[PDB]
């Protein structure tokens, strides 16, 4: 079957309100479902919003994951989203750095 692995882009923190920053990853243009997303190899679970995917007019899916972290952690704590797309045997670990 035809598959297409995702293009993963950072959603950089800049996105900060009352001492909390939101950052994330955009998992673009993959096929078929599903993708899974973890953060810091499963170390970061609290305040994570992931999925569901959107089906674009192209017939490809996109999905995002956003985590809210303390703003003081930025540039200290590394944030890596771990994206797995089993159907294409692709994994992407994207480092999300402040802009």
């Amino acid at each position: 079957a035809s598959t297409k692995g995702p293009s993963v882009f950072p959603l950089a923190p800049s996105s900060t309100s009352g001492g909390t920053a939101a950052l994330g990853c955009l998992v673009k243009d993959y096929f078929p479902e599903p993708v899974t997303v973890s953060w810091n190899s499963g170390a970061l679970t609290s305040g994570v919003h992931t999925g569901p995917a959107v089906l674009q007019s192209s017939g490809l899916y996109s999905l995002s994951s956003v985590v809210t972290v303390p703003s003081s952690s930025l540039g200290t704590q590394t944030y890596i989203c771990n994206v797995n797309h089993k159907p294409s045997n692709t994994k992407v670990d994207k480092k999300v750095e402040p802009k």
Partner: protein, 101 residues
């Protein structure tokens, strides 16, 4: 019975723009009940082309969350002073705005 949405709008990443693509991501959370309308503006003009909004899903905070995406060309993105994601929930609207770097 209502809780207003929290909204974060992300501009296209530098990496995506370098790949000749652009996506705005509007992350919506913490709202109840679980229905929203999402409207996008390019400067002040309403746009529906390239928009996909998810159906809100219940989170572990017992409140609803959703996403809206706007796909556009890098040239479209750079041609405007700003884009806005406007989230209407029970008649009231939370709007976030971002601009090219």
């Amino acid at each position: 019975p209502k809780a207003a949405p929290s909204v974060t709008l992300f501009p296209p990443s530098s990496e995506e723009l370098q790949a000749n693509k652009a996506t705005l991501v509007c992350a919506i959370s913490d709202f109840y009940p679980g229905a929203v309308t999402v409207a996008w503006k390019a400067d002040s003009s309403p746009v529906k082309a390239g928009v996909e909004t998810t159906t809100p899903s219940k989170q572990s905070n017992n409140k609803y969350a959703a996403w809206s995406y706007l796909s556009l060309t890098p040239e479209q993105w750079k041609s405007h002073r700003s884009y806005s994601c406007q989230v209407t929930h029970e008649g009231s609207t939370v709007e976030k705005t971002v601009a090219p770097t």
